[PDB]
């Protein structure tokens, strides 16, 4: 009398295909997905402080476009810019707009400190019907439109020392009138100039006269510039016309703040990773949702699926007829 002892392994009726160095297609017993390919379509407001810009770009919030007044002294981990955003103040452009947007977004804050600037010989608080705040004409909340007083516009020459321990960000502008008549009615001189300087940097802009396309009533433009002042250093503003003056500085920070263009709705939920598509889970090493991410996110990858085998090769059972 004898006995038969067989050794064998399990197999399933529902196998799944994976890749190896050798095969494009091996059936194994079990597998797990490594590519996150789905999003709810919503951005979770936990744990990152999400700031919905609504109808305002970060730049328009920075300057003080009236319908963006709600964003004064605001902070964020991630600023969200909507496609529905619109400017509704003075027609403006920003040379190297992208850099200004970037540095402010990274700073993560619109904390503004008003400074006691003194503008002798000139009229202050200029307004326009292109930039209404309330019933009447107005202007960027953070900017001061300076014009002639009487029949004179003197050479402005002012100082603001930084005796703090942080960097000051100064936002200022230059007015480009559309006519020589406009150029002499506001600032008297035939051609103005704006010089803003620290001890190691200077920017002089000469305003340009010319008709630009009609925008909110106007063919004139304002060009926006910025200046960072380090501790110990000092700001000097010199101009004989066309100065769009700062009212103080923005406090600069370093940290984890950024900005994202997305139309995804903000939702009360929890997620570390944010894409413009919406929040995605971070349990998988890879994701195919968006190359644009913020936070603890899986690495973006071109594959929509990568299957990691979690079981042995699936081998069918033999039966002789």
Ligand X SMILES: *[C@@H]1O[C@H](CO)[C@@H](O[C@@H]2O[C@H](CO)[C@@H](O[C@@H]3O[C@H](CO[C@H]4O[C@H](CO)[C@@H](O)[C@H](O)[C@@H]4O)[C@@H](O)[C@H](O[C@H]4O[C@H](CO)[C@@H](O)[C@H](O)[C@@H]4O)[C@@H]3O)[C@H](O)[C@H]2NC(C)=O)[C@H](O)[C@H]1NC(C)=O
Ligand Y SMILES: *[C@@H]1O[C@H](CO)[C@@H](O[C@@H]2O[C@H](CO)[C@@H](O[C@@H]3O[C@H](CO[C@H]4O[C@H](CO)[C@@H](O)[C@H](O)[C@@H]4O[C@H]4O[C@H](CO)[C@@H](O)[C@H](O)[C@H]4NC(C)=O)[C@@H](O)[C@H](O[C@H]4O[C@H](CO)[C@@H](O)[C@H](O)[C@@H]4O)[C@@H]3O)[C@H](O)[C@H]2NC(C)=O)[C@H](O)[C@H]1NC(C)=O
Ligand Z SMILES: *[C@@H]1O[C@H](CO)[C@@H](O)[C@H](O)[C@H]1NC(C)=O
Residues that bind ligand Y (CB under 6 A): 30, 32, 310
CB 228 within 8 A of CB 257: no
Stretch of 122-130, 211-219, 261-269, 301-309 contacting a second copy, by CB under 8 A? 211-219
| Distance of alpha carbon 58 from alpha carbon 141, whole angstroms | 14
| Distance of alpha carbon 95 from alpha carbon 252, whole angstroms | 20
Residue 113 interface partner, choices ligand Y, ligand Z, another protein, none, CB cut-off 5-8 Å depending on type: ligand Z
- Which position among 64, 142, 167, 222 is part of the footprint of another protein (CB under 8 A)? 167
Q: Read out DSSP for 106-117?
A: HHTB--EEE---
| Least CB distance to ligand X at residue 212 (A) | 7
Which is nearer to another protein, 223 or 258 (by Cβ)? Answer: 258
DSSP character at residue 298? P
| Distance of alpha carbon 105 from alpha carbon 94, whole angstroms | 15
- Which position among 106, 197, 203, 219 is part of the footprint of another protein (CB under 8 A)? 106
Q: Nearest 5°: phi and psi at 183?
A: -65, -30
Size of the site for a second copy (CB under 8 A): 29
Q: Is the dihedral of CA 227, 233, 239, 244 positive or negative?
A: positive
CB 53 within 8 A of CB 81: yes
Stretch of 6-14, 51-59, 129-137, 152-160 contacting another protein, by CB under 8 A? 6-14
Residue 106 interface partner, choices a second copy, another protein, ligand X, none, CB cut-off 5-8 Å depending on type: another protein
| Least CB distance to ligand X at residue 59 (A) | 23
Q: 199: which 2 tokens?
A: 């001890």
Residue 159, classed as helix, strand or coil, is strand
Residues of span 171-230 touching ligand X by CB under 6 A: 211, 213-214, 219
86 binds ligand X (CB under 6 A): no
87: Cα separation from own chain's centroid: 15
Chain residues binding a second copy by CB under 8 A are 91, 93, 157, 159, 176, 193, 195, 197-202, 204, 206, 208-213, 215, 221, 223, 233-234, 236, 238-239
Residues at the interface with ligand Z (CB under 6 A): 12, 14, 16, 30, 72-73, 111-113
């Amino acid at each position: 009398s004898t006995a038969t002892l067989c050794l064998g392994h399990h197999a399933v009726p529902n196998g799944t295909l994976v890749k190896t160095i050798t095969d494009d297609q091996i059936e194994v017993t079990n597998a797990t997905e490594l590519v996150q390919s789905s999003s709810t379509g919503k951005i979770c407001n936990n744990p990152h402080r999400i700031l919905d810009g609504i109808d305002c770009t970060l730049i328009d919030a920075l300057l003080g476009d009236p319908h963006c007044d709600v964003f004064q002294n605001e902070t964020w981990d991630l600023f969200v810019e909507r496609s529905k955003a619109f400017s509704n103040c003075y027609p403006y452009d920003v040379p190297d707009y992208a850099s200004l947007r970037s540095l402010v977004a990274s700073s993560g804050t619109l904390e503004f400190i008003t400074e006691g600037f003194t503008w002798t010989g000139v009229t202050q608080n200029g307004g326009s019907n292109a930039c209404k705040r309330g019933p009447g004409s107005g202007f960027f909340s953070r900017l001061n439109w300076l014009t002639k007083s009487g029949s004179t516009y003197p050479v402005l020459n002012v100082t603001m020392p930084n005796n703090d321990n942080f960097d000051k960000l100064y936002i200022w502008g230059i007015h480009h009138p559309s006519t020589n008549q406009e150029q002499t009615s506001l600032y008297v001189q035939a051609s103005g100039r704006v010089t803003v300087s620290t001890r190691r940097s200077q920017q002089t802009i000469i305003p340009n006269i010319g008709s630009r396309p009609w925008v909110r009533g106007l063919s004139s433009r304002i060009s926006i510039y910025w200046t960072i002042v380090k501790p110990g250093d000092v700001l000097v503003i010199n101009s004989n016309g066309n100065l769009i003056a700062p009212r103080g500085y923005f406090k600069m920070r370093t940290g984890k703040s950024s900005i994202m263009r997305s139309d995804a709705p903000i939702d009360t939920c929890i997620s570390e990773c944010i894409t413009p598509n919406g929040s995605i889970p971070n349990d998988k090493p890879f994701q195919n949702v968006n190359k644009i991410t913020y936070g603890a996110c899986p690495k973006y990858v071109k594959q929509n699926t990568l299957k990691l085998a979690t079981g042995m090769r699936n081998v069918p059972e033999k039966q002789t007829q």
